[PDB]
Design a protein around this ligand. Structure first.
Ligand SMILES: O=C(O)/C=C/C(=O)O
Ligand SMILES: O=C(O)/C=C/C(=O)O
Ligand SMILES: O=C(O)/C=C/C(=O)O
Ligand SMILES: O=C(O)/C=C/C(=O)O
Lengths: 95, 23, 95, 23, 95, 23, 95, 23
């Protein structure tokens, strides 16, 4: 899944990091990884086999999970990036 | 024990393109 | 999945921790994360794309998995929270 | 080797609400 | 999934360890965890929501995955337990 | 880097029972 | 999934390492592990229950994910092995 | 925090054989 790098930057998701895609439009759920897309383009591209399940026009949720030590897990404040219909950042929430 | 935790997400993004047969 | 925090407390599952949901009513199985819900409300809310698979009225099992060292794994006593039809705690079992 | 183990669960809970289009 | 503990012993899979079940009979694939069953009973019981996908009489493959350091991963010799139609051990292979 | 590796399996076991509504 | 070991060597995927298979032909997505196949044979064999979802003639993508420390994750350059219709290596890309 | 990252892949390989009932 190619993602406008501005969005990866705001989310704190690294290129090549594994991410789950939960499709709001059709309910599909899959695991793949993120690739950096042209900054400011608002691109969200589905490459490969995933194209069978996630289609252009679909509304999706990209989620990244990490492995935490007991201490860091209890202090974790997840980052949530909210975007508009063109995938431009509207707001970023912390924990 | 290590815990698997949700650390980040991009909410309600719109898919703009797809390429099943890319390389 | 928003969960009455009293239940998260009893289970030892942290807010934002990844959890699997296995649907007893329809057989759906998915991975998502837990969010703290109002204490004592008995809330079990399905937000986002997961709503396509898990419906209000469904009976479900929420399971959390951790990564253990050899020693801790052999001494592990999983916590099981049993609840009633209103999601109130009936009993908590250890290992 | 580290092992992935079931450490906790909430059994037979009833789903009380759902919101596909929340934010 | 309740498993005759003799089989867990032979496989080196701990009670409560996460395991994947790949169904040879119908193709279902799911993730759950193992529970120790009565020794010598040959029990392979599917409890909970998984019962929607894996039925009595099904032939299945139970697989456990671990997280390894570079060194241990290269020297790893997986354990394979072969059983008969009554789930009695026929042979155990190493790597 | 840590690798996720298959470390053990029980091959072609026969399911003997099921209980969807156990506790 | 039995894979011509020349391909495993080029990819840096170890025998027995867990891998995901994303099917370009039919959209199936599953998790299993790699087994070393005869070198130069170009073999890509699907053994067991996975045979229900991935068929001979299918075009697939085999992906391996690792667990990284913060530092190594930021310097990671994934290996991509491109092959022809007989599974012979055409090119290997780095990051 | 440790991150799960894609570290390698074999792209567009052709399945040459299958054996549902192997051992
Ligand atoms: O080709 C890939 O790298 C990924 C494909 C997918 O996730 O479907
Ligand atoms: O929106 C989320 O955060 C999660 C959605 C889901 O699990 O379906
Ligand atoms: O009830 C459980 O613990 C597991 C159920 C399942 O894997 O379906
Ligand atoms: O039999 C195995 O080892 C794996 C089977 C599968 O992934 O379907």
């Amino acid at each position: 899944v190619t993602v406008d790098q501005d969005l990866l930057d705001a989310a704190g998701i690294l290129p090549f990091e594994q991410v789950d895609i939960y499709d709001i439009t059709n309910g599909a759920r899959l695991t793949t990884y993120a690739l950096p897309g042209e900054r400011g383009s608002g691109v969200i591209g589905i490459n490969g086999a995933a194209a069978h399940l996630v289609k252009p026009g679909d509304l999706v949720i990209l989620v990244a999970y990490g492995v935490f030590d007991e201490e860091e897990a209890r202090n974790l404040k997840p980052t949530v990036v909210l975007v508009d219909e063109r995938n431009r950042i509207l707001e970023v929430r912390k924990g | 024990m290590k815990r698997v935790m949700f650390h980040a997400k991009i909410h309600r993004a719109t898919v703009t393109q797809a390429d099943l047969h890319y390389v």
